[PDB]
Amino acid sequence: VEDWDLVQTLGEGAYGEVQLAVNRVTEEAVAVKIVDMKRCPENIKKEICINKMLNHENVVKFYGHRREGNIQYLFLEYCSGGELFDRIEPDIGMPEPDAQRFFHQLMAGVVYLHGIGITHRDIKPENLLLDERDNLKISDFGLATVFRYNNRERLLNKMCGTLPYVAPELLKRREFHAEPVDVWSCGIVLTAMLAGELPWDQPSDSCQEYSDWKEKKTYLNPWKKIDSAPLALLHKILVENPSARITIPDIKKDRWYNKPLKKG
Numbered sequence: 372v373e374d375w376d377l378v379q380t381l382g383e384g385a386y387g388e389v390q391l392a393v394n395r396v397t398e399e400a401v402a403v404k405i406v407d408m409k410r411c412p413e414n415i416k417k418e419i420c421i422n423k424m425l426n427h428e429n430v431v432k433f434y435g436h437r438r439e440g441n442i443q444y445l446f447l448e449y450c451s452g453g454e455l456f457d458r459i460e461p462d463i464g465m466p467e468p469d470a471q472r473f474f475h476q477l478m479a480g481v482v483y484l485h486g487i488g489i490t491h492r493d494i495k496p497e498n499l500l501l502d503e504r505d506n507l508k509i510s511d512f513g514l515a516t517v518f519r520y521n522n523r524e525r526l527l528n529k530m531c532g533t534l535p536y537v538a539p540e541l542l543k544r545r546e547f548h549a550e551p552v553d554v555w556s557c558g559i560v561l562t563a564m565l566a567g568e569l570p571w572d573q574p575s576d577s578c579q580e581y582s583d584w585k586e587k588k589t590y591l592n593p594w595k596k597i598d599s600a601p602l603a604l605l606h607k608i609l610v611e612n613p614s615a616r617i618t619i620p621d622i623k624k625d626r627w628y629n630k631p632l633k634k635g
């Protein structure tokens with residue numbers, strides 16, 4: 372209802388909703404996210420601000436914004452593929468080669484953000500969308516923040532994200548580095564892709580499955596389903612001390628990351 376028609380609803384969140392919009396003239400589809408500033412103005416000025424810095428094949432495109440009352444309309448690459456979340460069969464996952472391709476594209480997109488000083492802070496399957504050729508795009512920069520500016524890094528302090536995807540250090544430390552928190556969330560995504568379940572409600576000492584993982588009891592029930600090469604990588608990513616945790620440039624040299632699996 373704004374040059375374009377609002378055809379169907381797409382992701383009815385908390386803020387408002389993402390609707391799929393078609394232009395009646397040119398037939399061209401986009402996603403419009405609708406936030407009613409009445410039902411925050413602050414995190415949304417940061418969302419559009421971050422969006423405008425973004426340009427990458429693995430990040431959802433930002434087209435633009437109008438304000439039409441209280442009503443902000445962010446205009447965004449429609450992804451006809453939906454969420455990665457729906458590609459994961461519960462308890463089983465997906466073919467190893469499909470996970471590897473999606474993990475590569477997740478890595479490209481994270482490398483890019485980090486490169487420009489931006490941490491997403493809430494990477495999970497629900498926020499990874501698939502285009503027409505199944506290419507992964509990181510989506511929703513609503514919790515995104517800047518962690519490097521004029522080449523100085525700032526530690527984060529605010530806790531945010533989604534508990535099963537969060538790194539331990541965000542539960543435990545007053546300040547922590549952004550990058551390792553995104554790497555961790557990437558590991559839980561890999562886990563989800565390869566087993567079809569989440570390892571733990573949260574990475575606390577007070578949580579059994581997490582305790583079990585630090586004790587390397589991988590005979591148990593996310594990990595058993597995985598396979599020794601991708602598991603090896605997961606042992607490097609889901610390391611509790613954020614300093615000893617593998618980094619991306621080192622994920623790119625990992626044996627499974629570089630294992631040939633998948634046809635064109």
Ligand SMILES: NC[C@H](O)CNc1ccc([N+](=O)[O-])c2cccnc12
Binds near residue numbers: 402451499500510
């Ligand atoms: N973090 C956003 C979460 O993905 C919301 N759920 C969604 C499902 C499907 C589509 N879509 O283009 O089919 C969306 C498209 C744009 C935004 N969200 C979508």
